[PDB]
Design an enzyme around this catalytic site. Structure first.
Site, PDB file in Angstrom:
ATOM      1  N   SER A  15       0.723  -1.256  -0.007  1.00  0.00           N
ATOM      2  CA  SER A  15       0.011   0.101   0.090  1.00  0.00           C
ATOM      3  C   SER A  15       0.730   1.207   0.116  1.00  0.00           C
ATOM      4  CB  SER A  15      -1.033  -0.047   1.376  1.00  0.00           C
ATOM      5  OG  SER A  15      -1.775   1.207   1.712  1.00  0.00           O
TER       6      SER A  15
ATOM      7  N   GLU B 177      -7.795  -5.745  -5.924  1.00  0.00           N
ATOM      8  CA  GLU B 177      -7.232  -4.806  -5.080  1.00  0.00           C
ATOM      9  C   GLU B 177      -8.077  -3.867  -4.566  1.00  0.00           C
ATOM     10  OE1 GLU B 177      -4.313  -3.952  -4.089  1.00  0.00           O
ATOM     11  OE2 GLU B 177      -3.013  -5.013  -5.206  1.00  0.00           O
TER      12      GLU B 177
ATOM     13  N   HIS C  15      -6.711  -6.547  -1.675  1.00  0.00           N
ATOM     14  CA  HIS C  15      -5.432  -5.749  -1.305  1.00  0.00           C
ATOM     15  C   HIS C  15      -4.742  -6.496  -0.238  1.00  0.00           C
ATOM     16  CE1 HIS C  15      -2.997  -1.998  -1.420  1.00  0.00           C
ATOM     17  NE2 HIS C  15      -3.043  -1.855  -0.011  1.00  0.00           N
TER      18      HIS C  15
END
Ligand SMILES: *[C@@H]1O[C@H](CO)[C@@H](O[C@@H]2O[C@H](CO)[C@@H](O[C@@H]3O[C@H](CO)[C@@H](O)[C@H](O[C@H]4O[C@H](CO)[C@@H](O)[C@H](O)[C@@H]4O[C@H]4O[C@H](CO)[C@@H](O)[C@H](O)[C@@H]4O)[C@@H]3O)[C@H](O)[C@H]2NC(C)=O)[C@H](O)[C@H]1NC(C)=O
Length: 534
Positions: A184, A315, A437
């Site tokens: 991230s 994601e 994610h």
């Protein structure tokens, strides 16, 4: 007898921990790597740490950086947070092990190094390193001038990489074999380290998991507008940028961190922050970054060391998974789509206001077919967000590094869905919305209540750790012996070669001419990357 190491600043006493497969390792947690950024040193570049008297207790993780935690809806941590954690299965200066450094995610707003347990990694002969860097306005305030140039929290990171270079030998790490990794904001952070003079020669190779410095949410175009807004919310008089930063220096840290969420069009559901890396003014002394990431990259200015970068199949479950928490949230996105598209897709500052209606309608056309936002259109909402926020700029990262570096550059797409997903935590349910994610990262590290011991999940943990070990030693990333060879991205090809990881036992080489559907997102007129000007 608890493990003991001398570092430059003094003597540490750690604990003895056990790896996942029953092996002993030394753990040094809450190691200070910089002076506490407190008082006149709030907002300033990290200062050198004065050596400590006697033996420093490194048996426990110490406080995370003072942050708005959107999941707990509170301010938590401390200004005194610049702590590094070093884990070694070979406590000996002559061991010369590969060093795996991890920069945590949290959109530059929240998180901590100490959330990432290295139990799985310690079944390999590497030194693991997690750490904290300042977050939110504490880490990323900028007035666009000498009062607050910006990137304090990236300077914290660079300072931690400098500390690893000078000190990791004493934990049995090779300073000349540092694998720099992150997820991230951490993946973007790895990319930022490739771009900065401050981190040049301080890592042998990189892994940017689901993150690139080309992504809009990682970069502030109007920092001074953000700093003035923060200062006003907190009742600071507007005048000189000097008076602004000075008033913020004397307000309680907790008031300054909490205030950010009250800014106009603050990110919807608080999954991002406007207090992000920026371009520091020209002539800033020991700047992290004085030019827009894309212009540095396309000049071939990234460090010429290998790179793995990567995305997951879903994601966009960051942030879309938080939309399932309250059942009213999808109806709210439907009703307010035209006002909130610039918010959730993070082009608040990189598209004129008069162009928002237009772009909103194109996004809803392309991904939802102009259907209303609902449980029925949720998957397309996830793809849209994942493409814009993560996948597109991960593709540009891979292509542009492959193009300029002369170094092996690798891309993977992770589509293995295990027992648990980050969606579980963010949604507060056990629904399967696909592969979130960071669902790959939660196999490398143990994150609180997102660790599995299913046979298939345990095999993925081995595979991803074998990827990091093989990349850190031979330089040829290999998850299993049975898998087809992982081919690097071809320098200068319009085509991107990526390993599609469906499962631990199933992966093959695939190709995209339009990774993340870049052709769509590049056509909307965002003043970013290919389209950027002053
Ligand atoms: C996302 O992008 C949008 C679009 O650009 C951004 O929207 C702009 O947001 C700013 C606020 O952040 C806003 O600026 C205000 O404009 C008004 C013009 O009529 C002014 O009245 C107002 O001035 C006050 O606030 C300033 C700081 O924000 C102070 O410096 C100034 O002295 C004023 O302070 C008085 O008022 C405050 C309370 O507001 C009070 O506490 C003070 O004591 C004092 O009395 C701002 O300049 C723009 O108008 C917005 N533009 C549009 C078109 O909407 C948005 O900021 C972006 N958001 C993120 C998160 O990036």
């Amino acid at each position: 007898s608890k493990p003991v190491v001398r570092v430059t600043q003094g003597v540490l006493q750690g604990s003895w921990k056990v790896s996942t497969h029953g092996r002993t390792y030394a753990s040094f947690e809450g190691v200070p790597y910089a002076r506490p950024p407190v008082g006149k040193y709030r907002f300033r570049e990290p200062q050198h740490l004065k050596p400590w008297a006697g033996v420093w207790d490194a048996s426990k993780t110490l406080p995370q950086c003072l942050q708005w935690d959107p999941f707990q809806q509170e301010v938590s941590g401390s200004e005194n947070c610049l702590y590094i954690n070093v884990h070694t299965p070979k406590l000996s200066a002559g061991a010369s092990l590969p060093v795996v450094v991890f920069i945590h995610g949290g959109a530059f707003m929240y998180g901590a190094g100490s959330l990432y347990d290295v139990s799985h990694l310690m079944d390999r002969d590497v030194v693991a390193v997690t750490f904290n860097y300042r977050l939110g306005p504490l880490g990323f305030l900028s007035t666009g001038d000498e009062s607050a140039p910006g990137n304090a929290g990236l300077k914290d990171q660079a300072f931690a990489l400098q500390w690893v270079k000078n000190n990791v030998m004493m934990f049995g790490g090779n300073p000349d074999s540092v694998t720099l990794t992150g997820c991230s904001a951490g993946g973007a952070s790895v990319h930022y380290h490739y771009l900065s003079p401050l981190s040049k020669g301080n890592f042998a190779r990189g892994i940017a998991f689901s993150g690139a410095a080309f992504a809009s949410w990682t970069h502030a175009v109007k920092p001074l507008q953000n700093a003035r807004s923060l200062a006003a919310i907190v009742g600071c008089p507007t005048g000189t940028n000097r008076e602004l930063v000075d008033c913020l220096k004397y307000r309680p840290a907790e008031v300054v961190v909490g205030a950010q969420i009250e800014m106009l069009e603050f990110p919807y559901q608080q999954m991002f922050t406007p207090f992000t890396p920026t371009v520091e003014p020209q002539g800033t002394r020991d700047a992290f970054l004085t030019q827009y990431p894309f212009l540095v990259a396309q000049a071939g200015g990234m460090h010429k060391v290998p790179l793995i970068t990567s995305v997951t199949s879903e994601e966009g479950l960051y942030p879309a998974a938080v939309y399932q928490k309250s059942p009213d949230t999808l109806a709210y996105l439907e009703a307010n789509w035209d006002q909130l598209a610039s918010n959730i897709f993070e082009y608040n500052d990189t598209l004129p206001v008069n162009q928002r209606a237009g772009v909103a309608a194109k996004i809803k056309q392309r991904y939802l077919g102009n259907k209303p936002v609902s449980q029925e259109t949720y998957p397309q909402l996830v793809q849209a967000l994942g493409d814009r926020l993560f996948a597109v700029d991960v593709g540009k990262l891979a292509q542009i590094h492959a193009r300029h570096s002369g170094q092996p550059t690798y891309l993977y797409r992770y589509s293995f869905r295990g027992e648990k997903s980050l969606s579980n935590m963010m949604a507060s349910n056990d629904k399967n919305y696909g592969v979130s994610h960071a669902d790959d990262i939660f196999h490398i590290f143990k994150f609180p209540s997102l660790s599995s011991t299913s046979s298939e999940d345990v095999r993925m943990t081995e595979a991803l750790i074998d990827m990091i070990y093989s990349f850190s030693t031979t330089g040829n990333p290999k998850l299993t012996n049975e898998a087809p060879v992982w081919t690097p991205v071809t320098p200068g090809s319009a085509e991107l070669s990526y390993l599609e990881i469906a499962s631990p036992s199933r992966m093959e080489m695939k190709s995209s001419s339009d990774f993340g559907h870049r052709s769509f997102w590049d056509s909307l007129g965002f003043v970013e990357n290919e389209n950027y000007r002053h």
